[PDB]
Predict the 3D structure of the following.
Amino acid sequence: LIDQLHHEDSWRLFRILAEFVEGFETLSELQVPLVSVFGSARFGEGHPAYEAGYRLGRALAEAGFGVVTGGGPGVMEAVNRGAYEAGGVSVGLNIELPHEQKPNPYQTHALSLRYFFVRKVLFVRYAVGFVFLPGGFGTLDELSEVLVLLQTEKVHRFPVFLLDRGYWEGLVRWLAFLRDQKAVGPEDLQLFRLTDEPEEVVQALKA
Amino acid sequence: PLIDQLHHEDSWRLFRILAEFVEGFETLSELQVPLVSVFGSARFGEGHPAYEAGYRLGRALAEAGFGVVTGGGPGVMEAVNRGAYEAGGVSVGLNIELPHEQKPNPYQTHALSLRYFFVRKVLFVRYAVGFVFLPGGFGTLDELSEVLVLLQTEKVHRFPVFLLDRGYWEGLVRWLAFLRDQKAVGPEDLQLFRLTDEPEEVVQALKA
Amino acid sequence: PKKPLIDQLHHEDSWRLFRILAEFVEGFETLSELQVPLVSVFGSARFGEGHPAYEAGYRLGRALAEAGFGVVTGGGPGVMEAVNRGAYEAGGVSVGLNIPNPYQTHALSLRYFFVRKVLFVRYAVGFVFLPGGFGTLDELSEVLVLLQTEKVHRFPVFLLDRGYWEGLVRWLAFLRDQKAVGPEDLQLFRLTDEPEEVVQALKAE
Amino acid sequence: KPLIDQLHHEDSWRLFRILAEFVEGFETLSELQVPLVSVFGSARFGEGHPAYEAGYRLGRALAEAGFGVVTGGGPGVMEAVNRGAYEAGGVSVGLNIEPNPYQTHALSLRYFFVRKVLFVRYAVGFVFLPGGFGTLDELSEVLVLLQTEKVHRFPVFLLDRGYWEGLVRWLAFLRDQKAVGPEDLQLFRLTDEPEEVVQALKAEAP
Amino acid sequence: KKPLIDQLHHEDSWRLFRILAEFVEGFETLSELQVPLVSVFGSARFGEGHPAYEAGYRLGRALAEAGFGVVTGGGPGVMEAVNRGAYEAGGVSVGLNIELPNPYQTHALSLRYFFVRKVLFVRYAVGFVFLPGGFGTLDELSEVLVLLQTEKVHRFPVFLLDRGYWEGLVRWLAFLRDQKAVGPEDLQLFRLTDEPEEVVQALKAEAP
Amino acid sequence: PKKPLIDQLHHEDSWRLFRILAEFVEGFETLSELQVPLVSVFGSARFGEGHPAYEAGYRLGRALAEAGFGVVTGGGPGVMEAVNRGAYEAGGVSVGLNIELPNPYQTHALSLRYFFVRKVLFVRYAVGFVFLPGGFGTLDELSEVLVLLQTEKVHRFPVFLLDRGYWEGLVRWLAFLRDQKAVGPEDLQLFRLTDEPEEVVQALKA
């Protein structure tokens, strides 16, 4: 049987298990409500998405929320920074990639994960809401994931916001096409909300 | 006490999660044919273009010698499992347990029932030699965006990714091209997938 | 081909063990959430429609349901099916710990027999045994040991059909004569020919 | 508070204890390098009793024929079996339940169902001597497992014709009642001589 | 012919689960004891007749009568002396046996890993007594001193029986403090004493 | 108020144990993929630059890296840093098994949370072990090594104590243990005293 359980590669589960445990340990003991935030790892200082990210972080911490990001560069860094400097709780769920990049230096708690799926469960398990700033493959990845879990009711409902109407217009319309094709329910597009103001997102969560 | 702390951690959930991973590995590991993950709408039934196309793809892959792995649900997944099943090929369903349960189709040579989307998503890639996305909705988009990420960042081998039915994906691909003009995605990232109208082209690429 | 269940376990394959643990977790959630009092019943898997034990099984399930109790069986054919059927058709809560008859309100799907053994007693308010073979003797035997050694909370145990249990009960009296069992270990179970005497007894506790 | 009643779907640690016993038991038994015969008998019949003498001689002969013995590790007949095997230079295992001095290998278990798996997992044979509830409990489980094929097949022997007479005659009643298959009673053989048990086991082994 | 440690590999899951099992059983078994636990380690070679062995018995018994439970490495020699003394006195006698066990243990733990045994030795100890021994005893003593010095475990008195036997070692340790290799109060982590009675005496002076 | 590491181990918190198991996994992976022969080295964490111990450490590291060996230390300050620094600066592979809850001369810096995992990592791939003047930590590591070697719990490898003058008292006392018969005849041969890195290198070479 040595060959079977080998091709089974179950030993990979020790670390996967270590990652879940630490994650539950760390996130479950936080005292403030957690808001998961996402955005481009590539939009740095100056970029509208970065500035909006920093303002989002700041406002969330000053409202009592803690922020959970991938702890990477770009708007993630901006969001961690905004909440960090404001003194709020700032979590980073760092993913280990073949083409790394150091974790931003604005994490109150920093978790280092090897698997996206563990990182994904941790983004949802303790969230009172999710906010998506302009991003790329990774951001769409997270979004589509939350949409499914909500639409299918696998996880309790929670507010989902997409910041910057013009950036997301393209996706929203295709989703409307999906609704026209009857691929998604008649009320499924109301699972998320578009806005151009961070302040508006925070007010909505503050309730 | 710590009893409260351990309670908030809610780790007893891992027993089931682990059982599903272990069972999933034991099962898929034993299969002896290259496995192709296939996705499509759970709502487009018999008669619908996506369904017929799915039936043809399922049948073609089995003929070529591949086993198909789907979410075991209705619509295109059913058609894909059926095409494979009826051509005598290995047909796998990674059925997901939902609040408003859809019934598992009857065309699965191997059926697994999972409570967790993430476990199911892992089993979908761990043993795949390719991915085919047929018209679908939120469920399909979620699988597509996940695999694209895994390929873009290179966490898994760059196996072939196909999107069947050009006109259907047009909106998404154009928006992705916009993500490119914005530099939110790499210059070559749109080459991670191939858009096509011909099931034959997909099977041919996988055979090659 | 595929080996017997127990033999599929190898000291090398440790992760496989979590499949057993998860079965316990799931089983405990499923049965503990139920609020009706749960009475376990075991009996022959070969006595079908028209057999005395089957008819008795049907009357028992019915009476138990009529009384507000829930019944827990092995979920198979024979007197087992009779009991789930009698309870089920009377509007009672019917549970089956399946290793399946179509008379189950809650059908548990279990891979391991020993998890079932634990589930039969973890929430038991009583346990009734009807005419059966090895499986029934197996289950009765374990229940006596478990109670005799106090590995589980105490509950009444009834054996239905005096003539049928006769030989075994007498042999047990012999074991007591030999001093293999304690002075009052045979007081762990009660003998009766009436499903009504079983329901009365349980209601009285 | 009873062991079973302490089991809750949320108290993970109690579930890990079950895991721990499965791990240490499979690890210990699997590495033994002699065919393993399980033995069960009265915990109450100490030296002087005919079952004890029978158990002592059985373990002895077992050890001498190159078999290892696996008992519950308690007093009485179990002690006698371990002792007879131990004093003959043989491997002598005790699956102690939460212990006689004649155990070359001693396991500490809290969960009965785990011990029950370990009793049969590597069993090449199973012998039952005169006993009480514990003995009836183990025997009847082995027969169910052999009957429904939940474990590889292995011989089962009952020792002391006069003591098991009531139980056997009744199993015949069961077969006649047809609550048991035609050759299900054939799953075991009733005997008086421990030496033939060992002889028959050697015959069923190459 | 393979040493325990060399059999560990990141892919050999079962051996890592045995490590898991030893922690689970070790912590459960010891945590449930309702008597103050005092760990004792000494020569596995010195037998009946030798002072160390004799003193082990007095220690074992005196501890049991003062209401303390004893935890030893569970082997022969002085280890067995302590187990026997406490046991025959009706006290709680624990053995952390290593599968390289004396019959005087109220609870016998089967251990294969030296590092799991080391943790279990101090996890619940309210005192540690060291009798004349060899490599094993020095090893366990060094461990305790480092864990205490370093605050890796809660504090507890440490006693060394037989001022003569330990003479060479304590002076060398004194040399270390002279050399600044150790801190100003690190030699205070232990005390020499000639009779078991004294240790049980100093112990009785503890938590109210 | 938090407590010392060990006291944070509760019997009810079973899942937290996988963090330890994961640590071993990662540890075994990191170290086993290295191709250079790994020599574990231990010494005082207090003796810094200028202290004979530190200077001896630097030369030992240099000597081992130049001879082709990779060094493995606890990764801290004092003689540890000295050793890593000597090998690192000589272009050798420098490894530190750091307990993080680390000196700048490490090619590979492992981050460990459990000190007991580290103890296994110090010997699992050891081709040899060198101990320099130190205190409680060094003696603790020496003892464990001697015990694991004595009872053959790990493959044999050379153990060297550098600075005869400093180890004198300990070695003298150990000889006393042999007179007392607490240790075996050949047991003291498990280690060797030396006043120079070069003897260590010529030895490892052979």
About this structure: Chain F has seven helices and seven strands. Chain F touches chain D at residues 11-15, 17 (CB under 8 Å).
